[PDB]
Design a protein around this ligand. Structure first.
Ligand code: 6T7
Ligand code: ZN
Ligand code: ZN
Ligand code: ZN
Length: 100
């Protein structure tokens, strides 16, 4: 996993409502394998379910998404996981909500 990527600048402030790691996919409502967009904080399912976060990436261009299964962050442009101090606040909020 990368220690930086050129899309970290697109990570936006966490909503004051916080994160809900049990939030269903905004398109198909599935509770399985969802991700949260780190630009707009919409929640959509992963590639192995109905691929709605990949569709969101396509229709918005938003780069970075956070897994509600394992709190990894994937950048769709870099095609890699990313670890950076800039992602700690959001991973921590998600971790607190998930575990707790
Ligand atoms: O499931 C998603 O939509 C995002 C998360 N993610 N996406 C991919 C991926 C994306 C597009 C094409 N091939 C692989 C690879 C690893 C990963 O963690
Ligand atoms: Zn879905
Ligand atoms: Zn988005
Ligand atoms: Zn990137």
């Amino acid at each position: 996993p990368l220690p930086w990527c050129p899309h970290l600048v697109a990570v936006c402030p966490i909503p004051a409502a916080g994160l809900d790691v049990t939030q269903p996919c905004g398109d198909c409502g599935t509770i399985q394998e969802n991700w949260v967009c780190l630009s707009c904080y919409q929640v959509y399912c992963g590639r192995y379910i109905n691929g709605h976060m990949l569709q969101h990436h396509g229709n918005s261009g938003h780069p970075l998404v956070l897994s509600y299964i394992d709190l990894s962050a994937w950048c769709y442009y870099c095609q890699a996981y990313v670890h950076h101090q800039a992602l700690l606040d959001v991973k921590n909020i998600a971790h607190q909500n998930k575990f707790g």
